[PDB]
Design a protein around this ligand. Structure first.
Ligand SMILES: [Mg+2]
Ligand SMILES: [Mg+2]
Ligand SMILES: [Mg+2]
Ligand SMILES: [Mg+2]
Ligand SMILES: [Mg+2]
Ligand SMILES: [Mg+2]
Ligand SMILES: [Mg+2]
Ligand SMILES: [Mg+2]
Ligand SMILES: [Mg+2]
Ligand SMILES: [Mg+2]
Ligand SMILES: [Mg+2]
Ligand SMILES: [Mg+2]
Ligand SMILES: [Mg+2]
Ligand SMILES: [Mg+2]
Ligand SMILES: [Mg+2]
Ligand SMILES: [Mg+2]
Ligand SMILES: [Mg+2]
Ligand SMILES: [Mg+2]
Ligand SMILES: [Mg+2]
Ligand SMILES: [Mg+2]
Ligand SMILES: [Mg+2]
Ligand SMILES: [Mg+2]
Ligand SMILES: [Mg+2]
Ligand SMILES: [Mg+2]
Ligand SMILES: [Mg+2]
Ligand SMILES: [Mg+2]
Ligand SMILES: [Mg+2]
Ligand SMILES: [Mg+2]
Ligand SMILES: [Mg+2]
Ligand SMILES: [Mg+2]
Ligand SMILES: [Mg+2]
Ligand SMILES: [Mg+2]
Ligand SMILES: [Mg+2]
Ligand SMILES: [Mg+2]
Ligand SMILES: [Mg+2]
Ligand SMILES: [Mg+2]
Ligand SMILES: [Mg+2]
Ligand SMILES: [Mg+2]
Ligand SMILES: [Mg+2]
Ligand SMILES: [Mg+2]
Ligand SMILES: [Mg+2]
Ligand SMILES: [Mg+2]
Ligand SMILES: [Mg+2]
Ligand SMILES: [Mg+2]
Ligand SMILES: [Mg+2]
Ligand SMILES: [Mg+2]
Ligand SMILES: [Mg+2]
Ligand SMILES: [Mg+2]
Ligand SMILES: [Mg+2]
Ligand SMILES: [Mg+2]
Ligand SMILES: [Mg+2]
Ligand SMILES: [Mg+2]
Ligand SMILES: [Mg+2]
Ligand SMILES: [Mg+2]
Ligand SMILES: [Mg+2]
Ligand SMILES: [Mg+2]
Ligand SMILES: [Mg+2]
Ligand SMILES: [Mg+2]
Ligand SMILES: [Mg+2]
Ligand SMILES: [Mg+2]
Ligand SMILES: [Mg+2]
Ligand SMILES: [Mg+2]
Ligand SMILES: [Mg+2]
Ligand SMILES: [Mg+2]
Ligand SMILES: [Mg+2]
Ligand SMILES: [Mg+2]
Ligand SMILES: [Mg+2]
Ligand SMILES: [Mg+2]
Ligand SMILES: [Mg+2]
Ligand SMILES: [Mg+2]
Ligand SMILES: [Mg+2]
Ligand SMILES: [Mg+2]
Ligand SMILES: [Mg+2]
Ligand SMILES: [Mg+2]
Ligand SMILES: [Mg+2]
Ligand SMILES: [Mg+2]
Ligand SMILES: [Mg+2]
Ligand SMILES: [Mg+2]
Ligand SMILES: [Mg+2]
Ligand SMILES: [Mg+2]
Ligand SMILES: [Mg+2]
Ligand SMILES: [Mg+2]
Ligand SMILES: [Mg+2]
Ligand SMILES: [Mg+2]
Ligand SMILES: [Mg+2]
Ligand SMILES: [Mg+2]
Ligand SMILES: [Mg+2]
Ligand SMILES: [Mg+2]
Ligand SMILES: [Mg+2]
Ligand SMILES: [Mg+2]
Ligand SMILES: [Mg+2]
Ligand SMILES: [Mg+2]
Ligand SMILES: [Mg+2]
Ligand SMILES: [Mg+2]
Ligand SMILES: [Mg+2]
Ligand SMILES: [Mg+2]
Ligand SMILES: [Mg+2]
Ligand SMILES: [Mg+2]
Ligand SMILES: [Mg+2]
Ligand SMILES: [Mg+2]
Ligand SMILES: [Mg+2]
Ligand SMILES: [Mg+2]
Ligand SMILES: [Mg+2]
Ligand SMILES: [Mg+2]
Ligand SMILES: [Mg+2]
Ligand SMILES: [Mg+2]
Ligand SMILES: [Mg+2]
Ligand SMILES: [Mg+2]
Ligand SMILES: [Mg+2]
Ligand SMILES: [Mg+2]
Ligand SMILES: [Mg+2]
Ligand SMILES: [Mg+2]
Ligand SMILES: [Mg+2]
Ligand SMILES: [Mg+2]
Ligand SMILES: [Mg+2]
Ligand SMILES: [Mg+2]
Ligand SMILES: [Mg+2]
Ligand SMILES: [Mg+2]
Ligand SMILES: [Mg+2]
Ligand SMILES: [Mg+2]
Ligand SMILES: [Mg+2]
Ligand SMILES: [Mg+2]
Ligand SMILES: [Mg+2]
Ligand SMILES: [Mg+2]
Ligand SMILES: [Mg+2]
Ligand SMILES: [Mg+2]
Ligand SMILES: [Mg+2]
Ligand SMILES: [Mg+2]
Ligand SMILES: [Mg+2]
Ligand SMILES: [Mg+2]
Ligand SMILES: [Mg+2]
Ligand SMILES: [Mg+2]
Ligand SMILES: [Mg+2]
Ligand SMILES: [Mg+2]
Ligand SMILES: [Mg+2]
Ligand SMILES: [Mg+2]
Ligand SMILES: [Mg+2]
Ligand SMILES: [Mg+2]
Ligand SMILES: [Mg+2]
Ligand SMILES: [Mg+2]
Ligand SMILES: [Mg+2]
Ligand SMILES: [Mg+2]
Ligand SMILES: [Mg+2]
Ligand SMILES: [Mg+2]
Ligand SMILES: [Mg+2]
Ligand SMILES: [Mg+2]
Length: 271
RNA sequence: UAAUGGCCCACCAAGGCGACGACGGGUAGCCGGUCUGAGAGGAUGGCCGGCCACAGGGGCACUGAGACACGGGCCCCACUCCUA
RNA sequence: GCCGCGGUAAUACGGAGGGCGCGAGCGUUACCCGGAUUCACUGGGCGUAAAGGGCGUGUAGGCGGCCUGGGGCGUCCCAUGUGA
RNA sequence: UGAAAUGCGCAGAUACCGGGAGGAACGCCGAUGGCGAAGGCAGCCACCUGGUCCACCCGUGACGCUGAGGCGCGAAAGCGUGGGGAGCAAACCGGAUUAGAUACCCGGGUAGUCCACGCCCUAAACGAUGCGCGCUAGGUCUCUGGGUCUCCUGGGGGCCGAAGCUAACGCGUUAAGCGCGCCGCCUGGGGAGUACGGCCGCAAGGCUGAAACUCAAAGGAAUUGACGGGGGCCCGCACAAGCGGUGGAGC
RNA sequence: CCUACGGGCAGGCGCCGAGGGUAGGGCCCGUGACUGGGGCGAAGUCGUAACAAGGUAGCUGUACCGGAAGGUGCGGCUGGAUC
RNA sequence: GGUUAUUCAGAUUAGGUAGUCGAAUGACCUACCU
RNA sequence: CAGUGGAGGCCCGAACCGGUGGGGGAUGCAAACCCCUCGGAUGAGCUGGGGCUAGGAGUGAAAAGCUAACCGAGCCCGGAGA
RNA sequence: CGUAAGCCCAAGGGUUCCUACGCAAUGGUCGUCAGCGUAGGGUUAGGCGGGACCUAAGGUGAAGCCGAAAGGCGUAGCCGAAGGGCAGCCGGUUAAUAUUCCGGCCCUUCCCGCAGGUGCGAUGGGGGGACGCUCUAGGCUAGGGGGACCGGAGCCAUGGACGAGCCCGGCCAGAAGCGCAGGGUGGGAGGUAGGCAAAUCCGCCUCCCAAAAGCUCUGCGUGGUGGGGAAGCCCGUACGGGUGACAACCCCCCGAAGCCAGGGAGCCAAGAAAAGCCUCUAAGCACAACCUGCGGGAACCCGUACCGCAAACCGACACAGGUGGGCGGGUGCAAGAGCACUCAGGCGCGCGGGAGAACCCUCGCCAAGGAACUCUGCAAGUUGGCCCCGUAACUUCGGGAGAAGGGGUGCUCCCUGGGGUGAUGAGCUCCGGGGAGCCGCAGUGAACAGGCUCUGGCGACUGUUUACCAAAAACACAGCUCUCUGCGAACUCGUAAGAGGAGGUAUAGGGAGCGACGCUUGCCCGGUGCCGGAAGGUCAAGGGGAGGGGUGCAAGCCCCGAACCGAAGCCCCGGUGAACGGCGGCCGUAACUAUAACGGUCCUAAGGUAGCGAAAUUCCUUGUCGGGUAAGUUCCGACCUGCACGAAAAGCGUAACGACCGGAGCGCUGUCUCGGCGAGGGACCCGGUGAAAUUGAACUGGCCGUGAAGAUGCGGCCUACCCGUGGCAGGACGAAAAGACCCCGUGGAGCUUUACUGCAGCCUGGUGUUGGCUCUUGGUCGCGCCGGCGCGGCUGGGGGCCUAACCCUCGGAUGGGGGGACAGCGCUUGGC
RNA sequence: GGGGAGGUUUGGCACCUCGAUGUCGGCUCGUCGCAUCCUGGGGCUGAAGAAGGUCCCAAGGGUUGGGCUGUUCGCCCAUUAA
């Protein structure tokens, strides 16, 4: 399920790593209209905008098909399950009958071989994607859109997925990977079933360096800093939050909700 | 060596033993016999006869048909005495 | 020795008379066998008294139907040596 | 609820109709019922699969029975990772009862209960009855199978009882009878399923398992009784219905 | 040093060698502040858990909890009383 | 009239505990056990 | 079980990175050096070159450390003859 | 000196290069010398580097978006290189340059003409370029070793040797072709809806063949031939030129980290772009134009000296510091870029000479003792590599381990096993095993080179840090919990546009705390925070207008103003602890004593659970007891009356780890008893050069007084010839720094909060942007009709639907889709 | 109950020193005082002797090594003429 390690070295005694059995003996990404330069670290003034990112292995961006209604009715064969270094999910290089090739988030169950296709006609079989007004309520589906003709947003994380609770007018109900309850549009496309590689959560970085390869840098407790730096700044011998625990910017992080009441996305939720 | 034997040595082979109790630990001289018990059994080995082992502890060989020898020899340790 | 005895009327303590047993002995203690069929081969048990493994499956081991025949290992019998 | 109180309720509860979500368990059939080695197993559907009984007497020809150790299974609780989470519910909080009430009753409530995988391996894991085989009256109802079929025959499940066993209680062709094979276990109560050592286990723990000391017993079954905040039937100025009186005052 | 001149004894060296020394393990006995339970013994304190429906049926594996017996949860058991 | 605290005097008990129960005074408005 | 295999913020140790202890130096060789010693040394490694982020701002495995040899708020010129 | 202190690149430097003349200053002395002064020379390129090539981060930036101005963001494009692409190797010559001049061999583009060939043609399509880490094969080269073989001028010393003697040297480049070794690459045919319908290309489907060759490319070897070529000897300041051969130019071995290179295998952290190059076609052309050969022609710009681990760069200095890449020989040691010695090459560090005092530094040794030293074994010492034997608690089963403790190690002769090249053999080489023996005090004989154990604390671990007094027990960390966030995400930067988050989507991202792992994490929501709560209470603008006012002759104009409607917030109600936080006092009680399982009682929001406990917490205190020592305020084990532990500012524990901090023991020692001798670099003396802080001026003694209370300087007494040199640190309240402590100033600044007052931000009502239709409750005026029905403007509120503003988005759309009069933004209201 | 001496303690005062008079303990080197710990001389003694006690005189010299703590001090070990 996951590769363990004999403790021939500390850290290595706890560190597990995925088994890329599901990866169809295919190191190389499809160099074709498929990879792409990628880089970053912080924002477009020179300034850091997101703490503690940076460093960590070089990456190639694999272009992914998230609209998947360009090729309506056009089938394609699942040529490969590939490793994507920049999502939790695994990917499927699938060849279209067209001779067109793209990538898709490999869902659980997908076998290299499987035919697959998008469109309203399509079979409610694992892999195929089609509008929502069209999937039988109760179906667990993934890689969903949100507003129609707009690309997939919901449920793309590894082994995640949402179910259809019901329909209701031009909209359908969904239960997001978060448990949220939402009316999405009927005409929203969604590939069927749930996401590949659900085994993900159980890896265990195990050592410090491994987090670093991930490009995540060390992150330092508020407690550790000084008043200039951060509201937990009293430092004065390991010390108690002196107040309701806050962000480096001093907004409460202890439980305070942040979501803009008067958001219009509002009257389409329930969870 | 009186003589067989890994009894001892060199060389080679990878074996030998074990729940049918090896290996270890504890305990003990064994026997004819003796005590007990209806008997099967149990307990036992004083005296007597046989066998074994030992001679303050340990090691050794010499002489010899025979001993590694209680009242023989060499050595070490412990112990007693003599001393110039 | 055990069951127990002695808290006013003691055949259970101590003394007495008397009696019983055995006598150059009589008691105590120690240890062995017996009683103990209480390790049970002789000769024991397990529903509730102590005691059936929580249940399978199987290794070794133990045990094994009817008839003919060969050997004769156990088994049996005879003689003979031995059992000082 | 014994009666209550905490609790919920005008911020609109309880009762009622409609709509939706989610988890768990499977009413009636149901049983003195069946199946499985045991633990154990219950809506319906299919799929995959183990055992078992009967008929025909066709095949192999003693290939068997047991079974230390080993290996597997092993209720509930409990553990690890991850889900799930309606009702219930140790812990916990509150109400009440009480001398007190860390309980019984009530209101609330978390692990847990459910699933996947992994571990734990215990039990009144009980028929307190090891498995196999042959022997030794019958009566009764019941499940299941075969046969011209007011009944014979085989396999289970019960109650009553031949002989016989048995300390009694009870057993009795479902033996605790009569016999053989093999395994497991017992050897006075307490100390103690403890300690040490070993081996398992994430832990909680489990397996193996003493002794010092100490007691005159510990016990099984049955018999008389007496007692029960056990039951049934019945009696008495016992209570009730009823009239006086103490308790108060003085003596 | 002896010789019948071939050799012998003395002596030297080496092997092994009692034991002694050093170091590290194993088994066992004694002992140790203190601590754990256990057994017996005045007529001590606190409750009343079990025996009768023992006054909440009992026991039991486990789990939590509690001055203490013990209580509760989950399952199991009659070795449970009463129509 | 009520609440509470305490106390001994009784009361219920075979008896004790406790309690209930009663009274006084100050303040105030059925349970266990021998 | 043996073989093969060749993992690892694994071990010893130079380069390289670093600064643990002591001595020396203290108008120094040196405005942080020297010697002996010591830490890391396939990694959260070291490093050349090209770039971006700055003053209540940046950067910070967090010392209020660093930001051109003194940073609890850089340097310069100015308000200023506060 | 020789993994440099030698040699070649790059950066920085900028004439420091070479000559000639010269020494005032520069040079830490000297100077005839110089890196110094004067002057003259000196740097040569199609092929090396860079530009007339590509793209990276980034920058710039037509469009476009945003901002008071300045300016910000930004597409295409353009700029940007130690990365991609691209054609030169050996040797000679100068005082000074040289893949640059010359010699030799060998190449590249451009244009022209031509031959042959082909649908030609790009900025567009496609291929390719095009990629990580670790380990690694085959073959080869650089490089290196041996040679009795090839060449060579020479040498016989000092006892021996005329020899398989000694010493020197036995290479370098090279087109075609050939060979060896490797990389790259499927071929053919049909169909095609895709690569923004341009395709014979690429992709995808179908079948047939060859499964490898062939073709293509690269490395090496060879290869016509060109080159070079030592020791030693004569001339020689200089520095070379001759000799010096007509040189020889050959075998064998070791051998890369380099080459073949886009090789192979494994792994997870999943590993640039763009042009060149190839191919496809479009427009356009097919007398063009592409392609291949040959001939003739053309080929610019900039760098090129010298220094370059330093006396030429950065450090004010000819500064013991700092500075990226390549080469970096031999021998020995297990290996190596380590160590010792040494080639080549380069240096003796730009003050010397003496002396042989103290004292200081670096170093050596020491009788007996062996931690008694001391805050501390600080420091030194011991140990030290490899080989074999052996190795404990505990453990997370890997560890602990180099545990511990041991033995071996040199040289000679003999027997012998295996691997490599060759061929299987010899020779060479790599790694061994067995016996016999020799010498010394000692055999990793020198240099490199661990002392060890036991037991506490904290922290899991490797890591990080206060550049320049702190390296830690602090930070970090894998891991745990809480919390926010549904995507135009939350959050952060920005006035905005926008960006980061993320080309991510709840297995994700932001915040917070805790900090491997094991076992666990108790009670208290009264206060605070947060979350929930369509009721109520208060509450601003605004709406409303009874009622009152000013003025006017009036119509009016103007102002004040009650009820009543009006958000968020606060109040109120409930939840909430891995949210801020909190978690008691007193009296009585048991067989003697003591104690208190029991009770009582006051207070509370609730009174601290496990576990730990004189502790990184314990005041009293060196608590008390045990251990250890002759002796122990430390340490370890216990008890617990915890001044003042305690459960994620986590509680207890835990193998391993540690330049952490504590205690103990063994080894060893000059740490000490207790010092002594010796070495060198200073100190001292002579010659050259020649500072500094400091300094009221000085002709500057002791004592006892005294004085502003600590006198060379007043008094009194005592002592004392003048001047120096080497020494010591008691005084000159010695130097240094306008005391850091302390106070003061209505001085400053950083930090905090439930100080005050703002501001950003965020919440919020009205309103502008702002529209349509419809249902129903309230108002409003006219009418029909006995306070109510029907109607329209006005409506105010609430529900629903619409779409066209506004927002998002869609193969660019005068459009489709989604949201939608909301949101966003403007003004304004009150809040936090 | 009373009177003093000293100037080693704890203090009070705030006089020099805040354009600086470095703090506890140790080491090293001491030197002074005597109010004497030893040794020398003596008086009394409830001094037999021996050993002591108390006071007087006397600085000449001497006045150990370790354990524990930063300690001074103190406790402790082994001594000493002390
Ligand atoms: Mg952190
Ligand atoms: Mg702050
Ligand atoms: Mg704080
Ligand atoms: Mg801090
Ligand atoms: Mg603190
Ligand atoms: Mg033998
Ligand atoms: Mg052999
Ligand atoms: Mg014996
Ligand atoms: Mg004996
Ligand atoms: Mg017998
Ligand atoms: Mg015997
Ligand atoms: Mg015997
Ligand atoms: Mg005898
Ligand atoms: Mg005898
Ligand atoms: Mg003897
Ligand atoms: Mg004797
Ligand atoms: Mg002897
Ligand atoms: Mg004899
Ligand atoms: Mg003898
Ligand atoms: Mg004798
Ligand atoms: Mg004599
Ligand atoms: Mg004599
Ligand atoms: Mg009598
Ligand atoms: Mg009697
Ligand atoms: Mg009598
Ligand atoms: Mg008697
Ligand atoms: Mg017997
Ligand atoms: Mg017997
Ligand atoms: Mg028997
Ligand atoms: Mg029996
Ligand atoms: Mg059974
Ligand atoms: Mg026969
Ligand atoms: Mg369970
Ligand atoms: Mg639990
Ligand atoms: Mg049962
Ligand atoms: Mg019966
Ligand atoms: Mg009968
Ligand atoms: Mg029987
Ligand atoms: Mg047991
Ligand atoms: Mg048990
Ligand atoms: Mg044991
Ligand atoms: Mg656990
Ligand atoms: Mg009365
Ligand atoms: Mg003779
Ligand atoms: Mg021998
Ligand atoms: Mg009871
Ligand atoms: Mg009760
Ligand atoms: Mg109950
Ligand atoms: Mg009960
Ligand atoms: Mg009962
Ligand atoms: Mg059961
Ligand atoms: Mg019963
Ligand atoms: Mg019962
Ligand atoms: Mg009274
Ligand atoms: Mg390795
Ligand atoms: Mg490492
Ligand atoms: Mg480096
Ligand atoms: Mg100095
Ligand atoms: Mg500033
Ligand atoms: Mg300046
Ligand atoms: Mg001014
Ligand atoms: Mg080096
Ligand atoms: Mg010049
Ligand atoms: Mg030159
Ligand atoms: Mg000059
Ligand atoms: Mg000069
Ligand atoms: Mg100089
Ligand atoms: Mg001259
Ligand atoms: Mg001259
Ligand atoms: Mg000259
Ligand atoms: Mg030009
Ligand atoms: Mg734009
Ligand atoms: Mg460009
Ligand atoms: Mg070039
Ligand atoms: Mg022509
Ligand atoms: Mg073409
Ligand atoms: Mg092109
Ligand atoms: Mg590259
Ligand atoms: Mg020749
Ligand atoms: Mg000669
Ligand atoms: Mg030579
Ligand atoms: Mg020579
Ligand atoms: Mg070949
Ligand atoms: Mg096409
Ligand atoms: Mg076409
Ligand atoms: Mg073609
Ligand atoms: Mg063509
Ligand atoms: Mg070759
Ligand atoms: Mg060649
Ligand atoms: Mg040639
Ligand atoms: Mg040049
Ligand atoms: Mg340098
Ligand atoms: Mg300079
Ligand atoms: Mg110099
Ligand atoms: Mg080299
Ligand atoms: Mg010099
Ligand atoms: Mg010495
Ligand atoms: Mg010595
Ligand atoms: Mg001493
Ligand atoms: Mg100390
Ligand atoms: Mg040291
Ligand atoms: Mg060790
Ligand atoms: Mg040698
Ligand atoms: Mg070492
Ligand atoms: Mg570290
Ligand atoms: Mg520092
Ligand atoms: Mg963005
Ligand atoms: Mg954005
Ligand atoms: Mg992005
Ligand atoms: Mg992501
Ligand atoms: Mg746990
Ligand atoms: Mg807590
Ligand atoms: Mg209401
Ligand atoms: Mg009016
Ligand atoms: Mg008027
Ligand atoms: Mg109104
Ligand atoms: Mg409001
Ligand atoms: Mg809690
Ligand atoms: Mg509080
Ligand atoms: Mg009371
Ligand atoms: Mg203390
Ligand atoms: Mg203390
Ligand atoms: Mg003490
Ligand atoms: Mg206390
Ligand atoms: Mg907390
Ligand atoms: Mg806390
Ligand atoms: Mg470290
Ligand atoms: Mg001042
Ligand atoms: Mg003032
Ligand atoms: Mg002020
Ligand atoms: Mg209306
Ligand atoms: Mg409205
Ligand atoms: Mg709508
Ligand atoms: Mg629309
Ligand atoms: Mg719409
Ligand atoms: Mg238009
Ligand atoms: Mg809509
Ligand atoms: Mg001054
Ligand atoms: Mg001064
Ligand atoms: Mg001071
Ligand atoms: Mg006297
Ligand atoms: Mg005297
Ligand atoms: Mg006097
Ligand atoms: Mg005197
Ligand atoms: Mg004196
Ligand atoms: Mg003290």
């Amino acid at each position: 399920a996951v590769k363990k390690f004999k403790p021939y070295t500390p850290s290595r005694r706890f560190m597990t790593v995925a088994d890329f059995s599901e990866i169809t003996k295919t190191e190389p990404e499809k160099s074709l209209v498929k990879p792409l330069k990628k880089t970053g670290g912080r924002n477009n003034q020179g300034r850091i905008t997101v703490r503690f990112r940076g460093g960590g292995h070089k990456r190639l961006y694999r272009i992914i098909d998230f609209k998947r209604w360009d090729k309506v009715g056009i089938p394609a064969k699942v040529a490969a399950i590939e490793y994507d270094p920049n999502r939790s999910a695994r990917i499927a290089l699938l060849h279209y009958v067209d001779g067109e090739k793209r990538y898709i988030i490999a869902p659980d169950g997908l076998q290299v071989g499987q035919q697959v296709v998008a469109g309203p006609d399509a079979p409610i079989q694992v892999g195929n994607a089609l509008p929502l007004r069209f999937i039988p309520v109760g179906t667990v589906v993934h890689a969903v859109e949100l507003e129609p003709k707009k690309g997939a947003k919901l449920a793309r994380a590894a082994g995640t997925s949402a179910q259809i609770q019901g329909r209701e007018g031009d909209y359908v109900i969904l239960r997001l990977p978060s448990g949220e309850l939402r009316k999405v549009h009927g005409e929203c496309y969604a590939t069927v079933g749930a996401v590949g590689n659900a085994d993900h959560k159980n890896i265990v970085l195990g050592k410090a360096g491994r987090s670093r390869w991930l490009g995540r840098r060390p992150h330092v407790r508020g407690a550790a800093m000084n008043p200039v730096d951060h509201p937990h700044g009293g430092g004065e011998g390991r010390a108690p939050r002196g107040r309701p625990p806050a962000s480096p910017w001093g907004w409460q992080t202890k439980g305070l909700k942040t979501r803009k009441r008067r958001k219009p996305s509002s009257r389409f939720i329930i969870a």
